[PDB]
């Protein structure tokens with residue numbers, strides 16, 4: 001009798017329930033940023049979530065900023081993702097690839113030919129960044145030329161082509177948490193004077209140019225987008241977030257997208273934060289007429305409330321799904337939740353990744369069987 005467990009129709013995609021695996025960077029790609037059988041197992045284990053949004057996946061080496069995240073810009077990478085989508089689909093799951101460009105949240109040691117990370121404007125984020133040779137201060141990034149934006153937009157279009165060939169049901173545009181697109185959206189990071197800076201509609205321009213390009217590949221009802229309307233993560237700031245996101249969301253609503261994915265302000269990227277704000281999903285339900293996914297800090301009870309009060313249509317869980325591959329079944333049965341271990345969120349191997357237990361061992365067996373079958377299919 002939990003609305004969390006009610007099947008949901010996503011414009012032809014028959015989701016098993018109203019719960020979503022939030023996108024989660026795990027830094028466990030194989031060589032050349034290629035997904036592995038072990039990654040296929042991880043997603044196959046979590047196929048019981050109604051919808052699985054993959055970890056952020058860079059559209060280019062220029063768009064990477066952390067070790068061993070997977071890409072979607074080479075055929076080798078596509079072939080690795082094929083194991084993932086095959087195993088998820090053999091378990092009757094649904095999976096969207098999250099397309100990524102870290103913008104200024106990178107280091108030249110990740111970049112082709114030691115180039116600086118690129119950004120709307122040359123403003124470094126505060127603090128330090130993990131590199132192949134340890135922690136380092138951020139560099140001032142290079143501000144993109146006007147004629148380079150169309151080239152980054154085209155990288156998204158090519159990424160969407162590769163996502164479709166890899167067998168993803170859809171794609172999610174990462175426009176949150178301080179990365180390239182979010183940097184363009186906020187006037188604290190966007191100081192451009194050309195047609196991508198200045199007015200609210202110029203700073204949003206790159207998001208709409210990305211959406212136009214990827215909707216030449218997928219139908220718009222298979223394209224989602226993720227926003228963080230009020231976060232300080234990675235040095236973000238903007239002088240009028242209400243007017244920024246109300247506009248952006250109202251314009252997103254007329255685009256007939258798969259969904260809008262909003263992060264609650266009580267999350268600062270990957271951690272909980274003490275924070276008062278009125279730019280939460282309650283505020284954006286009015287302005288968006290499509291499918292609305294709410295994310296960040298939810299438990300069973302608080303997620304159920306959002307659905308019951310119709311403040312959202314779907315609820316995304318991140319850290320709990322890291323630790324509970326069968327989170328819907330645990331909610332349904334009022335079962336204890338495995339605690340999540342932050343120490344193994346990032347990097348490493350099966351430990352803290354595929355070795356969290358199920359309520360039903362046949363669930364683990366079936367995920368292993370499909371991961372192994374998927375590897376044999378796409379050897």
Ligand SMILES: Cc1cc2nc3c(=O)[nH]c(=O)nc-3n(C[C@H](O)[C@H](O)[C@H](O)COP(=O)(O)O)c2cc1C
Pocket residue numbers: 022023024025026054055056098174176177226263267269270271295296297298316317318319320345346
């Ligand atoms: C370890 C970790 C990795 C994450 N990676 C991503 C990511 O790749 N893309 C993204 O949009 N959000 C990412 N997030 C943010 C989550 O999607 C989610 O918004 C956040 O964990 C809060 O939701 P929760 O309380 O259900 O965990 C990550 C969060 C964590 C903790």
